[PDB]
Scaffold this active site. Structure first.
Site, PDB file in Angstrom:
ATOM      1  N   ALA C  12       0.913  -1.173   0.033  1.00  0.00           N
ATOM      2  CA  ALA C  12      -0.060   0.024   0.063  1.00  0.00           C
ATOM      3  C   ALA C  12       0.952   1.231  -0.093  1.00  0.00           C
ATOM      4  CB  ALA C  12      -0.876  -0.127   1.053  1.00  0.00           C
ATOM      5  N   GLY C 143      -1.307  -4.642   6.409  1.00  0.00           N
ATOM      6  CA  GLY C 143      -0.236  -5.642   6.128  1.00  0.00           C
ATOM      7  C   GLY C 143       0.845  -6.161   6.994  1.00  0.00           C
ATOM      8  N   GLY C 144       1.445  -7.218   6.970  1.00  0.00           N
ATOM      9  CA  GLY C 144       2.592  -7.444   7.646  1.00  0.00           C
ATOM     10  C   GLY C 144       3.673  -6.701   7.441  1.00  0.00           C
ATOM     11  N   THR C 145       4.356  -6.536   6.455  1.00  0.00           N
ATOM     12  CA  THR C 145       5.136  -5.417   6.247  1.00  0.00           C
ATOM     13  C   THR C 145       4.870  -4.050   6.626  1.00  0.00           C
ATOM     14  OG1 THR C 145       5.874  -6.708   4.401  1.00  0.00           O
ATOM     15  CG2 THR C 145       7.069  -4.671   4.575  1.00  0.00           C
ATOM     16  N   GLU C 254       5.547  22.468  11.848  1.00  0.00           N
ATOM     17  CA  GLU C 254       4.354  23.441  11.744  1.00  0.00           C
ATOM     18  C   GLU C 254       3.066  22.401  11.703  1.00  0.00           C
ATOM     19  OE1 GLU C 254       5.108  26.801   9.283  1.00  0.00           O
ATOM     20  OE2 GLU C 254       3.237  27.646   9.478  1.00  0.00           O
TER      21      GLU C 254
HETATM   22  N1  LIG Z   1      -5.580   2.408  -0.461  1.00  0.00           N
HETATM   23  C1  LIG Z   1      -4.980   1.156  -0.853  1.00  0.00           C
HETATM   24  N2  LIG Z   1      -4.785   0.356   0.130  1.00  0.00           N
HETATM   25  C2  LIG Z   1      -4.010  -0.721  -0.327  1.00  0.00           C
HETATM   26  C3  LIG Z   1      -3.347  -1.127  -1.331  1.00  0.00           C
HETATM   27  N3  LIG Z   1      -2.615  -2.094  -1.320  1.00  0.00           N
HETATM   28  C4  LIG Z   1      -2.903  -2.710  -0.211  1.00  0.00           C
HETATM   29  N4  LIG Z   1      -3.910  -1.791   0.666  1.00  0.00           N
HETATM   30  C5  LIG Z   1      -4.518  -2.205   1.776  1.00  0.00           C
HETATM   31  O1  LIG Z   1      -3.391  -2.840   2.551  1.00  0.00           O
HETATM   32  C6  LIG Z   1      -3.899  -3.760   3.543  1.00  0.00           C
HETATM   33  C7  LIG Z   1      -3.109  -4.870   3.245  1.00  0.00           C
HETATM   34  O2  LIG Z   1      -1.577  -4.529   3.601  1.00  0.00           O
HETATM   35  P1  LIG Z   1      -0.370  -4.694   2.272  1.00  0.00           P
HETATM   36  O3  LIG Z   1       0.118  -3.368   2.277  1.00  0.00           O
HETATM   37  O4  LIG Z   1      -1.088  -5.148   1.078  1.00  0.00           O
HETATM   38  O5  LIG Z   1       0.312  -5.706   3.024  1.00  0.00           O
HETATM   39  P2  LIG Z   1       2.230  -5.435   3.118  1.00  0.00           P
HETATM   40  O6  LIG Z   1       2.469  -4.267   3.594  1.00  0.00           O
HETATM   41  O7  LIG Z   1       2.704  -5.516   1.802  1.00  0.00           O
HETATM   42  O8  LIG Z   1       2.426  -6.559   3.915  1.00  0.00           O
HETATM   43  P3  LIG Z   1       2.681  -8.181   3.533  1.00  0.00           P
HETATM   44  O9  LIG Z   1       2.044  -8.425   2.124  1.00  0.00           O
HETATM   45  O10 LIG Z   1       2.082  -9.050   4.622  1.00  0.00           O
HETATM   46  O11 LIG Z   1       4.250  -8.682   3.648  1.00  0.00           O
HETATM   47  C8  LIG Z   1      -5.023  -4.093   3.111  1.00  0.00           C
HETATM   48  O12 LIG Z   1      -5.801  -3.569   4.161  1.00  0.00           O
HETATM   49  C9  LIG Z   1      -5.455  -3.514   1.748  1.00  0.00           C
HETATM   50  O13 LIG Z   1      -6.645  -2.953   1.574  1.00  0.00           O
HETATM   51  C10 LIG Z   1      -3.301   0.202  -2.291  1.00  0.00           C
HETATM   52  O14 LIG Z   1      -2.612   0.277  -3.390  1.00  0.00           O
HETATM   53  N5  LIG Z   1      -4.050   1.321  -2.065  1.00  0.00           N
HETATM   54 MG   LIG Z   2       2.842  -7.655   0.498  1.00  0.00          MG
END
Ligand SMILES: Nc1nc2c(ncn2[C@@H]2O[C@H](COP(=O)(O)OP(=O)(O)OP(=O)(O)O)[C@@H](O)[C@H]2O)c(=O)[nH]1
Ligand SMILES: [Mg+2]
Ligand SMILES: Nc1ncnc2c1ncn2[C@@H]1O[C@H](COP(=O)(O)OP(=O)(O)CP(=O)(O)O)[C@@H](O)[C@H]1O
Ligand SMILES: COc1c(Cl)cc([C@@H]2c3cc4c(cc3C[C@H]3C(=O)NC(=O)N23)OCCO4)cc1Cl
Ligand SMILES: Nc1nc2c(ncn2[C@@H]2O[C@H](COP(=O)(O)OP(=O)(O)O)[C@@H](O)[C@H]2O)c(=O)[nH]1
Ligand SMILES: [Ca+2]
Ligand SMILES: [Cl-]
Ligand SMILES: [Mg+2]
Lengths: 424, 346, 437, 54
Positions: C12, C143-145, C254
């Protein structure tokens, strides 16, 4: 990324061969291993299940195992027999006589180290191996005894990779021998400890589907294996095809398994096909999939509750419509979905349809209703064990009957652990 | 087939409406903590509004307006009237009121400034002390003020209607209760059936200390009163008989002498807080049943004493009002496969 | 001129980072290869856009950005994308296998093996800064990361850059947009660990973005690209004062000073208007009074909540386009009399207003029509505690059964960390209640 | 309803309007948390291999 596939025993190799025939067609690979497709979505994640050998050839990352040569000799001469790496056929000559002890302790021990030799070679040729998938039955000797022996050796060497199995449960309706409850009870003990996720494929459910709904009066193993390879194709779709959701084995296990020992899934497919032209709609596609008559473990989902559900739809269809219907099935029968795991039903769409079907839906459920399956096996087990019947086949191979008592107890515990979550 | 959830078992109103929904076959009741509901008959206290309207694929509707307590609790109502320009520091239909905090801002300095003046002016100066039982009427500020120092809750004291409309026979007080439904479009529906809570005791101006002639509450009459149920059943008079009495004695009608003012008071209060509680552009929808409490003085002028947010209906009327809640409030959002209400509109 | 370094973590954060830098390049007239013709100084700059773009002798303007993800795929598309030449290889960090939606796997197991590499690449950018204000960190809560590794990075950035501000853009989980079942766990875990390392966090609910994309853009099932392009406009609106000449929110400090009176309560609500579909042939252009009024409609907030039932601590209106101060005060005077806008007692009831004459840039071929004037309201309201209550409730349901806990303990985390994290959130909700009612 | 600190430039304007007056762990602590989780993982792996050895 990469998955290593193992198929052990007669049932394991017959459903595994059918699995590779189906997905090779989906990815556009002919029996010679040459790609001949028109879309490129096919090749984007082909590496998950195929190594690319020199000459634009794709070879399955598959290892074929049996204690008897006959079944694999039919594979090698089958439709896609020459597509497998010839070195990846590993087999003895003695057979296991439908005896779990022979596969796990005597004849299987003599052959397991050469299977692991091939497992190492395929794993070393992996960019970032994600885990293993094993196809076998629980009611014979090779796939269940030597199969579970393979799992614990594999876990010893790769303790941090995902272990995944498609396990065929025995049923008196489709029975080869009377000792199948013994072999199944001993295998479930192993699976409950050394696998991250097991797709319970009940041969009774397959038989009822082939007869009651598919209307085939005398089903053959080919009829049952038509449903299994269809099911296997659906569950692996998100692993091997590009989509909004790109799935892997670990995220599947993290999200489907709220407790380590409760990792036994009941799958479901729609439309149930027999070896049509009237395409279904997303409404009727959803209702069939969740119905009992479409499920491969012969359990009644209404007798339990769903801990988690993962669903995938194949074909050109409205995702807004797939959402409404999935949200509708939940909101209408929310009694059968637990309230302490919020948003436990996930849904994916893949626009690439399976062969011969314009639209299809596949279903992976972690339901407490699966306890009926282990209840059935434990009862058939106890009916014989209370009289020590047919046990000499196993004590003759060095097993003591205390190991039987332990395997029965562990399964009853499993049944009991599913029971407590059915009420909470 | 819709899904709803019940969270206050005590309400006789919303227990009966649940039965009616189930009795249509098209509504099923879920467990309390199942979040996948179309309708919530939530609890009176600490209802979780922050969790409504977030379930995917669900239109959610709750039977309470978030922020309606400002109208339904005494001290808030007094501060709402005095500080809202849409009600003025003085509206002609609400008694002079002052909210005062106990020993443990406060208007007790303001009250005594007005109370003293009225004492000097020889005008009758009886005031009533209340909080959201423990009710005190007196003619001296100090008697009431010491009375509330014992209490730990913030109190409000307002002018006592020394001259009430007294029903004959009996020389007896009454209070009119009206039921008002506000639906999700913020239409205001007055139920065409009200009730009069009658005191069974002649009204005495000497001793405001004996409770029964001054308090018309059903429990204060069922227990602590002498001849409960003498003139009408259960000390409850309905509008048809009250209308007949007004026609016979005062040569007027209930609609003109009283009901026009009741409709004005209900409209003023609800239009006043509408921008603060409306769910017009919200992610969930609200409706609510209200109970307005009115007093009628000797000039057939209507005063608002209290607005009740979790009200109970009269037993006879229960069926008709609980059915009307379904049609007006619930089935307007969730259809199924003359009107008992007067619509109050601008 | 003081520089800002952007950090994008997880899928994300990386994909939103793609959307933003695509928009920043359009807003500053930077070609995809890095050339900016309008810049008259070659190879050097003290300009406002230099806070986000370093300059090279060849004329390439390079984002002061780091993209880090444990999985290779989402960053592999930055490498092959249209803006591939814009980014230096050392800026794009990948691992082999992801965190499996497991905070513990991203924070402990995999976080340890890659934390020192991410910090070296970040210092490689800090060493090219004459005066760093701090960092903008983009990540998901679920997400995990995004949850696990970010909170580890936030701890090491507080150590290695102690005198620097850290700003957060966080994606709040919503089941409409693809979520894991354990995202409540990851959200509470990462918030507890990051709360004392972030000076201001702009929280974005995927439910809000999804709903705006269906109502205003009439997309019936939005994709990440739709979501991110909208999120990029809000982010651009918030960071515009760092990249353009102005006198309001000119440095990261700020944002803290104007929006966060109490440090723990550092989650401003963002409201954006107007959002109009590009497919709208005949469209009527909204006024200052209209778009400033839309800023108090709940359907335009980045987090769904009711600000009427809260108290404001700080409010900042960021206009972009044909806006004049006279029309802002007229629009403010009328709105205050028509809406329930109650401040806390210990704060001035007012509005810091910033106007940027350049109307919002939109990507060619996007779903957003170009408008003449738009506004982002940044308000610190106690109403956003509703978002924490929702999340804590989902956390509580699963944790009562210890569901999925074994995955976290399996990565070396201790079950007690769940309860410590949950207890922190209980404290946070209480802090909102004290200030709020 | 006053306007204060109004600034003007080519790119836009900024001002304030007041309607009403008012009425960390160190590097080594982190290395220890991360290393404490690492041994708990190692201890679990050893117990598994010990069970697999039996
Ligand atoms: N708005 C938005 N949300 C996103 C996007 N990609 C993933 N998400 C949200 O992020 C969450 C999942 O986290 P990710 O960022 O996909 O997981 P990660 O940080 O890559 O971690 P891991 O895959 O577990 O190693 C979910 O709630 C998704 O809805 C994006 O491109 N835009
Ligand atoms: Mg991921
Ligand atoms: N200013 C006033 N003048 C005369 N009587 C008054 C009065 N204020 C209250 N009362 C009396 O109080 C009685 C009921 O009490 P009140 O309505 O104040 O609180 P309550 O709790 O009993 C009803 P609610 O449940 O709506 O709050 C009325 O029947 C009326 O006789
Ligand atoms: C064949 O279809 C599959 C497969 Cl193989 C795997 C998944 C799993 C999955 C399963 C869940 C769930 C979340 C997720 C996350 C999702 C993801 O982002 N990557 C991934 O691998 N995921 O929440 C509750 C119930 O099950 C989903 C589907 Cl539909
Ligand atoms: N579904 C299915 N089940 C099979 C097939 N072959 C055997 N079985 C079942 O598997 C059990 C026997 O196992 P089998 O594979 O023949 O034994 P093994 O080769 O020694 O491992 C019995 O319960 C059979 O009903 C098959 O092709 N399909
Ligand atoms: Ca320059
Ligand atoms: Cl520093
Ligand atoms: Mg056989």
């Amino acid at each position: 990324r990469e998955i290593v596939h193992i198929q052990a025993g007669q049932c394991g190799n017959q459903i595994g061969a059918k699995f590779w025939e189906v997905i090779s067609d989906e990815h556009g690979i002919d029996p010679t291993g040459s790609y001949h497709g028109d879309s490129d979505l096919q090749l984007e994640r082909i590496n998950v299940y195929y190594n690319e050998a020199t000459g634009n050839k794709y070879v399955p990352r598959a290892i074929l195992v049996d204690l008897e040569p006959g079944t694999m000799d039919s594979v090698r001469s089958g439709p896609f027999g020459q597509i497998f790496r010839p070195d990846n056929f590993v087999f003895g000559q003695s057979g296991a006589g439908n005896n779990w002890a022979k596969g796990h302790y005597t004849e299987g021990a003599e052959l397991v180290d050469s299977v692991l030799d091939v497992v190492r070679k395929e794993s070393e040729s992996c960019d970032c191996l994600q885990g293993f998938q094993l196809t076998h039955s629980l009611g014979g000797g090779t796939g269940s005894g030597m199969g579970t022996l393979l799992i614990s050796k594999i876990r010893e060497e790769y303790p941090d990779r995902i272990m995944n199995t498609f396990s065929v449960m025995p049923s008196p309706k489709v029975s080869d021998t009377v000792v199948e409850p013994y072999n199944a009870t001993l295998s479930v003990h192993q699976l409950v400890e050394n696998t991250d996720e097991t797709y319970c494929i009940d041969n009774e459910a397959l038989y009822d589907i082939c007869f009651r709904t598919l209307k085939l009066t005398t089903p053959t193993y080919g009829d049952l294996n038509h449903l299994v390879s269809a099911t296997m194709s659906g569950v692996t779709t998100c692993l091997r095809f590009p989509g909004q959701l790109n799935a892997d084995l670990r995220k599947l296990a993290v999200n489907m398994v709220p407790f380590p020992r409760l990792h036994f899934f009941m799958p479901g497919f729609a439309p149930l096909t027999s070896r049509q032209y009237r395409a279904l709609t997303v409404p009727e596609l959803t209702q069939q999939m969740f119905d009992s008559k479409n499920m491969m473990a012969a359990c009644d989902p209404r007798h339990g509750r769903y801990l988690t559900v993962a669903a995938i739809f194949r074909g050109r269809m409205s995702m807004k419509e797939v959402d409404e219907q999935m949200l509708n099935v939940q909101n209408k029968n929310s009694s059968y979905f637990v309230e302490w795991i919020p948003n436990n039903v996930k849904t994916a769409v893949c626009d690439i349809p399976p062969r011969g079907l314009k639209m299809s839906a596949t279903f992976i459920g972690n339901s407490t209703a699966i306890q009926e399956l282990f209840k059935r096996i434990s009862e058939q087990f106890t009916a014989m064990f209370r009289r020590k019947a047919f046990l000499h086949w196993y004590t003759g191979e060095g097993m003591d009957e205390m190991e039987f008592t332990e395997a029965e107890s562990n399964m009853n515990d499993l049944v009991s652990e599913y029971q407590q979550y059915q009420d909470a | 087939m819709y899904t709803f959830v019940v969270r206050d078992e005590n309400s006789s109103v919303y227990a009966e409406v649940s039965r009616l929904l189930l009795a249509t076959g098209q509504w099923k009741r879920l467990r309390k903590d199942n979040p996948r509901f179309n309708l919530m008959l939530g609890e009176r206290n600490r209802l979780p509004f922050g969790r409504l309207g977030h379930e995917p694929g669900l239109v959610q509707l709750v039977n309470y307006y978030r922020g309606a307590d400002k109208l339904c609790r005494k001290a808030s109502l007094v501060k709402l009237i005095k500080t809202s320009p849409e009600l003025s520091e003085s509206c002609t239909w609400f008694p002079e009121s002052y909210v005062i905090y106990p020993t443990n801002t406060d208007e007790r300095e303001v009250f005594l400034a007005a109370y003293n003046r009225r004492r000097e002016g020889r005008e009758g100066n009886v005031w009533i002390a209340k909080s959201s039982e423990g009710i005190l009427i007196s003619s001296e500020a100090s008697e009431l003020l010491d009375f509330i120092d014992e209490q730990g809750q913030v109190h409000v004291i307002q002018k006592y209607l020394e001259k009430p409309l007294l029903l004959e026979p009996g020389h007896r007080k009454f209070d009119i209760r009206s039921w008002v439904l506000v639906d999700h479009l913020y239409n205001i529906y007055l139920y065409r059936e009200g009730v009069l809570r009658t005191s069974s005791e002649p009204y005495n101006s000497a001793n405001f200390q004996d409770k029964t002639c001054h308090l018309t509450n059903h429990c204060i009459q069922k227990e602590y009163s002498k001849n409960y149920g003498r003139y009408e059943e259960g000390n409850e008079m309905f509008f048809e008989e009250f209308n007949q009495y007004l026609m016979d004695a005062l040569n007027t009608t209930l609609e003109n002498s009283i009901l026009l003012q009741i409709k004005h008071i209900i409209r003023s209060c609800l239009m006043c807080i509408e921008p603060a509680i409306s769910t017009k552009h919200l992610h969930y929808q609200s409706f609510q049943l209200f109970g307005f409490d009115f007093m009628v003085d000797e000039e057939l002028k209507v005063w608002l004493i209290e607005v009740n947010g979790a009200p109970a209906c009269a037993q006879k009327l229960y069926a008709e009002l609980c059915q009307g809640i379904v049609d007006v409030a619930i089935s307007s959002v969730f259809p199924l496969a003359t009107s008992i209400f007067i619509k109050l509109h601008h | 001129m003081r520089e800002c370094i952007s950090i994008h973590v997880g899928q994300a954060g990386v994909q939103i980072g793609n959307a933003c830098w695509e928009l920043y390049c359009l807003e500053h007239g930077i070609q995809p290869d890095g050339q900016m013709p309008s810049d008259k100084t070659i190879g050097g700059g003290d300009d406002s856009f230099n806070t986000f773009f370093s300059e090279t002798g060849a004329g390439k303007h390079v984002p002061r950005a780091v993209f880090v993800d444990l999985e290779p795929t989402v960053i592999d598309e930055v490498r092959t994308g249209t803006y591939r030449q814009l980014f230096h290889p050392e800026q794009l960090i990948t691992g082999k296998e992801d965190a499996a939606n497991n905070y513990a796997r991203g924070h402990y197991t995999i976080g340890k093996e890659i934390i020192d590499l991410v910090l070296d690449r970040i210092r490689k950018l800090a060493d090219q800064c004459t005066g760093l204000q701090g960092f903008l960190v983009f990540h998901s809560f679920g997400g995990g990361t995004g949850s696990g590794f970010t909170s580890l990075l936030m701890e090491r950035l507080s150590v290695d850059y102690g005198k620097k501000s850290k700003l957060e853009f966080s994606i709040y989980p919503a089941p409409q947009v693809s979520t894991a079942v354990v995202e409540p766990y990851n959200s509470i875990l990462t918030t507890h660990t990051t709360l004392e390392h972030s000076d201001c966090a702009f929280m974005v609910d995927n439910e809000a973005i999804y709903d705006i994309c269906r109502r205003n853009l009439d997309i019936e099932r939005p994709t990440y690209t739709n979501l991110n392009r909208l999120i990029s406009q809000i982010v651009s609106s918030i960071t515009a004062s760092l990249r353009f000449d102005g006198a309001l929110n000119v440095d990261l400090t700020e944002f803290q000073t104007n929006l966060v009176p109490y440090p723990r309560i550092h989650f401003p609500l963002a409201t954006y208007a107007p959002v109009i579909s590009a497919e709208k042939a005949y469209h009527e252009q909204l006024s200052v009074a209209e778009i400033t009024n839309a800023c108090f409609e709940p359907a335009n907030q980045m987090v769904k909540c009711d600000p009427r039932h809260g108290k404001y601590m700080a409010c900042c209106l960021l206009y972009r386009g044909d806006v004049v101060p006279k029309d802002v005060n007229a629009a403010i005077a009328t709105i205050k009399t028509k809406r329930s806008i109650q401040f806390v007692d210990w704060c001035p009831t007012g509005f810091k207003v910033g106007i940027n004459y350049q109307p919002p840039t939109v990507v060619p071929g996007g779903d957003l029509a170009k408008v003449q004037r738009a506004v982002c309201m940044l308000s610190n309201t106690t109403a956003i505690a509703e978002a924490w209550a929702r999340l804590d409730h989902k956390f509580d349901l699963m944790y009562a059964k210890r569901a999925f806990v074994h995955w976290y303990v399996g990565e070396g985390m201790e079950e007690g960390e769940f309860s410590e994290a949950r207890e922190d959130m209980a404290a946070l909700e209480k802090d909102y209640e004290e200030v709020g009612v | 309803m006053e306007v204060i600190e109004l600034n003007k430039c080519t790119s836009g304007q900024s001002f304030e309007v007041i309607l009403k007056p008012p009425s960390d762990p160190s590097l080594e602590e982190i290395q220890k948390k991360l290393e404490a989780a690492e041994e708990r993982r190692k201890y679990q792996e050893a117990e598994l291999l010990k069970h697999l050895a039996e």
